[PDB]
């Protein structure tokens, strides 16, 4: 039962990571709004919240990596294998998105110092590209998994359904992440 128990736990690890990511995205959105209001014309607390959620997500990603390793090892039919791979896919998307979020945080902080880049751009582009491919690969795995269900009870179908909601939440998070990159690029243009 160690695989099935690990797969269930890994679903909760991923949800918790995505939740923590969501709070972090809201903080970067606040930061950008505040910056725009000053060029139109609390930061110590903002730093602390950024540092707290950054630490939290780091520890949640570490737990999810360690659980992934355990499940992949216990795995060694196609359904379970698909479910484990889809956990890996989602995890990779979260790791990638977190790095993009940390690049946006860096941008905010630079802009902030001047209201108190070529390499940045290149890294944003590289990770954005990566994330698009990981989302595409998760969508493909999700179709596959849904097809395997047609050909363990309601437990496995339930997990497949929740993985669809986790991917949906990653996609929504990417939509808003990409919006913060556009906002930081608009602010960058204005100071240059």
């Amino acid at each position: 039962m160690q695989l099935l128990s690990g797969i269930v736990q890994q679903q909760n690890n991923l949800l918790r990571a995505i939740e923590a990511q969501q709070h972090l995205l809201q903080l970067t959105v606040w930061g950008i709004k505040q910056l725009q209001a000053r060029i139109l014309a609390t930061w110590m607390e903002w730093d602390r919240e950024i540092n707290n959620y950054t630490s939290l997500i780091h520890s949640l990603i570490e737990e999810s990596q360690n659980q992934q390793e355990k499940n992949e090892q216990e795995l060694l039919g196609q359904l379970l294998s698909g479910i484990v791979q889809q956990q890996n896919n989602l995890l990779r998307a979260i790791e990638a998105q977190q790095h993009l979020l940390q690049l946006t945080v860096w941008g905010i902080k630079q802009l902030q110092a001047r209201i108190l880049w070529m390499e940045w751009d290149r890294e944003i582009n590289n990770y954005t590209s990566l994330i698009h491919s990981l989302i595409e690969e998760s969508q493909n795995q999700q179709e596959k998994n849904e097809q395997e269900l047609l050909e363990g009870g309601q437990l496995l179908s339930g997990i497949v359904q929740q993985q669809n909601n986790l991917l949906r939440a990653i996609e929504a998070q990417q939509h808003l992440l990409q919006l913060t990159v556009w906002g930081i690029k608009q602010l960058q243009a204005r100071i240059l």
Partner: antibody
Amino acid sequence: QLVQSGAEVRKPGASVKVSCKASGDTFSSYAISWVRQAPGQGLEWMGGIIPIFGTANYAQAFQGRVTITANESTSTAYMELSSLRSEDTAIYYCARDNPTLLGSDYWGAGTLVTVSS
Amino acid sequence: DIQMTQSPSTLSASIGDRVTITCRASEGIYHWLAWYQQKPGKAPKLLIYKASSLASGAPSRFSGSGSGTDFTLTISSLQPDDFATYYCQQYSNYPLTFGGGTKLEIKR
């Protein structure tokens, strides 16, 4: 989904402010672009705003003369073009820039602005 | 700013023919390139986003290709509704910029 204000006539040197009304959803997760097209000519990007931040960017040609604002309380975006000359006569479109697509998925119907005496 | 150049400016082809049009950026824009279709009297319509993805409501006879600085839109077999002006637009960096357009005309 994007409702624009009615056609306008202005004299040279005057200004015009055109509006684009969207939903709640648009203003909380999308960007708004303004794009114009003189009769028989091509599309020209004027600028854009991201309402949740208030950030904006303008094309080089209109720096100095264009202002884009958006007030979240009415989900309305506006484009104000100053020092109007006759070559500004065009259809002015608002467009919703979708960050999942990196493209414009919805357009308003366009607003005729005619600049003449 | 980033300059977009479309080629050719105009093109004639029979209904049923294949065509390719091209868009070139003055600097690398990765895959951040969209194509739009416009009929006279109408707003533009997104057909392709991120260089090669079909937008909702765009038929499979359309495809896009390319990366960096050189991009292409291909229609494998033209139907009456495809004769229109096509614009590219880069979404790599602000300010955003359109190509000059390619008008497609029916040959008879």
